[PDB]
């Protein structure tokens, strides 16, 4: 399709065109500093995914339950009716909580995995 | 300074583009990655004993080169299907 082509589509029709907005991230002084900056932003996003256990995936399911105080809309009110921009404008004050919960859950899963893999 | 730094950044960009390709295909973290895309005999009709045992990687690249824009698209489409099937299986219960 194209870059941001699903920007105006609902959240359930924009979760299929993910490999198209992912590949177009493409990862004297004025340009080189922005190439390095783009690399740094890409690597920070990859590091976030990795710390969460989502490395190598574009759609990653986690073990963190959804708190109704973050958003109390039903699935048919989010995936079918809202766009990703409206969702970002909704859940934005809470990303510093969700990200912390995701890394804590991954740390617990990693320690449980090394304990299970040392059982025998 | 600039001449070398631009090639260090370029090498980083090429490495990251290859890693991103592997990741989109579901091959992140692997050097030998098996996929679910079947081989089309129009890409190459040589048998396994004519490829793995008789040809070098340069000859193979010179053979399958006009078809990498098809194989890569098939690989990312298969991974997108596998990711959606995986989230559906992981939401079953």
């Amino acid at each position: 399709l194209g870059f941001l082509g699903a920007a105006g589509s609902t959240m359930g029709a924009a979760s299929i065109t993910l490999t198209v907005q992912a590949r177009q991230l493409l990862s004297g002084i004025k340009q080189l500093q922005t190439r390095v900056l783009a690399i740094e932003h890409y690597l920070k996003d990859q590091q976030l995914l990795g710390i969460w256990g989502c490395s190598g995936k574009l759609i990653c399911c986690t073990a963190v339950p959804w708190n109704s105080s973050w958003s109390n809309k039903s699935l048919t009110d989010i995936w079918d009716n809202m766009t990703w921009m409206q969702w970002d404008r909704e859940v934005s004050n809470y990303t510093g909580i969700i990200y912390r919960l995701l890394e804590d859950s991954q740390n617990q899963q990693e320690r449980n995995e090394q304990d299970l893999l040392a059982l025998d | 300074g600039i001449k070398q730094l631009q090639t260090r950044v370029l090498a980083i960009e090429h490495y990251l583009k290859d890693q991103q390709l592997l990741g989109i295909w579901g091959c992140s973290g692997k050097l030998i990655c098996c996929t679910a895309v079947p081989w089309n005999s129009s890409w190459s009709n040589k048998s396994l004993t004519d490829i793995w045992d008789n040809m070098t990687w340069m000859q193979w690249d010179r053979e399958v080169s006009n078809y990498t824009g098809i194989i890569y698209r098939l690989l990312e489409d298969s991974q997108n299907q596998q990711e959606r099937n995986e989230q559906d299986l992981l939401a079953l219960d």
Epitope: S15, L75, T76 | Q81, N85, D88, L89, L90, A91, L92
Partner: antibody
Framework: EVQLVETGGGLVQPGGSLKLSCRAS????????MSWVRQAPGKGLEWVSL????????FYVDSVKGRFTISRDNSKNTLSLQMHSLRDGDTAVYYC??????????????????WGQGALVTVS | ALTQPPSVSGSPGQSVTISCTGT?????????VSWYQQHPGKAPKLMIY???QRPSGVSDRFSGSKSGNTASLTISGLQADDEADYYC???????????FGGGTRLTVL
Amino acid sequence: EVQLVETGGGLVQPGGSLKLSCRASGYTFSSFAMSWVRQAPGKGLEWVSLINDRGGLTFYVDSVKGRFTISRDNSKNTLSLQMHSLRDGDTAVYYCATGGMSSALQSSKYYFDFWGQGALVTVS
Amino acid sequence: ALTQPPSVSGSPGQSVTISCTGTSSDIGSYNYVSWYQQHPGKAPKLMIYDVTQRPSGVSDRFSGSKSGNTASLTISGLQADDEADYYCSAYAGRQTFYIFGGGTRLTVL
């Protein structure tokens, strides 16, 4: 008023194959995980197989694993079930049903909402 | 599978309960029970889904509940047109999937 019309069925001899097909109308087809359910004469309902809304995932009852194939075509709005070997225990009315699963981005549909009229499969 | 009383009866205007008993892996662990009404011929119709929910088009005469490992459908104020075979079902798991039960021939008196 949705309409599921199962066009198929008849008589087979132990060891044969038979295909069933089910056409849907009145609602969006590629949004519901369809299934098949068997009712042997004089007995109750038993679930046979389930297919997801996209067709990529299929599930079967253990008693039919390796013999039945369930497939759907979202461009024709059709569901089909192709059975092999067809043992005497498979004689039943086979109902086309809509429900049993969801896409993980919609609410749970762990129930068979809309049923068909039923195809009759006889093994002798 | 799931045990369900073979038949229950009562007079018009009375309430009747149709129980369904499963194990901890079937009804206890999963609150996904459902009930279907099948008149002779035609096809089963959905009456109840989930423990307490009903689909649109079904009146509030039909209800149900779950306690422990036993599910029950209650019909109040029985009409002559309710003479049908009722079936319970539940989601067992990602392995066994849906397990139905025997039929409760309801014969209003």
